[PDB]
Design a protein around this ligand. Structure first.
Ligand code: HEM
Length: 385
């Protein structure tokens, strides 16, 4: 019957939404679309409306029949995110997780993380530079940096790190529902052991602090594993894309390097411009019928949160296709918003400001080996300097 527009997985161009996504954003704030998996979904295309939906408690992770729930992509890994719970349960669990995690990232606490973040970048950059160019910025710097910072902050003693790495590759390579339940189970038991160690021997770290709050071992282990998933690929991929963006815009890179305040804004601009559409948060579903934006979203419908659409909405940014390291203000939604806002954001900002500063201070000429066109077609990111 339908002729819904069909979204696809083609990599976006640098600083430009795809023709189809510009046409949708142009046409209206909200549309019925077909996802790359072939299911129906609502795509919200504009900054104001997405922001408002991100605060709407009628959208969440529960679905009464998860196996027939619409999906953006088939992914055994993301399937485990879809709660079977009643909607109210889902909301309470979510609010309680936010209550438990938010104190861990207070101003004072993130200040206390900063010297480990500085130290980890110096150590890893020292090693990456010693190996000489060309090097794989992804596999040899940005991923290890993000993971090291996570170890330091969550409380993974150095001796246990080799196994963590391995269990994490072991969830990265997974590809069926059995293998993905099993890989989760192994990581979980590993993490429960970390929790028991820290009960015996507290540190100034997330696991000890959650222990202190009289949470049971399962609950601490679940929170710690969630933090591992939230803080790893996200950081590495914004960092990778930032190096590409900053290498490609020499005068702004120079302005960012001359003034830490410009560097702070440059980080915000990398966050805004790292992906120009096509990356969608994990699935989220209306838990009850809702009128929104001219349509009726039905209980159980898939609603897509593509944060790159708002980030390139000319209604929210002047000249959205321009990389402006000094853009101010910069209300990007790369950390989500409302009920879905990144609790690690202050830490993520710190990792990005620290690594862009040290990379481009020590290696002023650093750039990708391939030109952007070829790069677009990261598993690896080879750079020279
Ligand atoms: C590197 C840049 C990062 C970006 C761009 C990012 C982005 C986001 C986004 C968009 C959300 C909402 C996700 C969703 O509902 O699907 C989120 C949630 C979350 N992030 Fe981050 N994140 C980053 C790094 C981190 C770090 C380093 C940590 C902590 C170690 C962290 C911890 C969290 C937590 C705990 C949530 C759950 C909050 C909730 O669902 O209410 N993130 N992040």
């Amino acid at each position: 019957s339908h002729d819904l527009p069909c979204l696809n997985l083609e990599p976006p161009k640098m600083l430009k939404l795809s023709p189809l996504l510009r046409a949708l954003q142009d046409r209206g704030p909200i549309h019925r679309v077909r996802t790359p998996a072939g299911d129906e979904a609502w795509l919200v295309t504009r900054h104001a409306e997405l922001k408002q939906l991100l605060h709407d408690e009628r959208i969440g992770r529960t679905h009464p029949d998860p196996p027939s729930a619409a999906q953006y992509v088939r992914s055994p890994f993301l399937d485990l995110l879809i709660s079977d719970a009643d909607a109210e349960s889902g909301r309470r669990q979510h609010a309680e997780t936010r209550r438990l995690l938010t104190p861990l990232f207070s101003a004072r606490r993130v200040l206390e993380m900063q010297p480990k973040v500085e130290e980890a970048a110096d150590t890893l950059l020292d090693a990456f530079i010693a190996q000489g160019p060309p090097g794989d910025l992804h596999g040899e710097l940005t991923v290890p940096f993000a993971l090291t910072v996570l170890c330091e902050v969550i409380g993974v003693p150095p001796q246990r790190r080799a196994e963590l790495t391995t269990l994490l590759a072991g969830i990265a390579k997974l590809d069926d529902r059995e293998g993905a339940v099993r890989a989760q189970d192994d990581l979980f038991g590993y993490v429960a052991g970390l929790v028991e160690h820290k009960r015996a021997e507290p540190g100034p770290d997330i696991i000890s602090r959650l222990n202190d709050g009289e949470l049971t071992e399962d609950r601490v282990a679940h929170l710690a594993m969630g933090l591992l998933f939230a803080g790893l690929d996200s950081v590495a991929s914004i960092m990778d894309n930032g190096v590409v963006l900053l290498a490609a815009h020499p005068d702004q890179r120079a302005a960012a390097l001359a003034d830490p305040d410009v560097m702070a804004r440059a980080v915000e601009e990398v966050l805004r411009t790292a992906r120009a559409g096509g990356s969608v948060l994990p699935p989220r579903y209306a838990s009850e019928d809702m009128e929104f934006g001219g349509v009726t979203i039905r209980a159980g419908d898939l609603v897509l949160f593509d944060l790159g659409l708002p980030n390139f909405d000319e209604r929210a940014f002047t000249g959205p296709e321009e990389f402006d390291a000094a853009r101010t203000p910069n209300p990007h939604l790369t950390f989500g918003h409302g009920i879905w806002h990144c609790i690690g954001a202050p830490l993520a900002r710190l990792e990005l400001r620290t690594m862009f500063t040290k990379l481009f201070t020590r290696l002023p000429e650093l750039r990708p080996e391939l030109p952007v066109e070829q790069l677009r077609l990261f598993a690896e990111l080879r750079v020279v300097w």
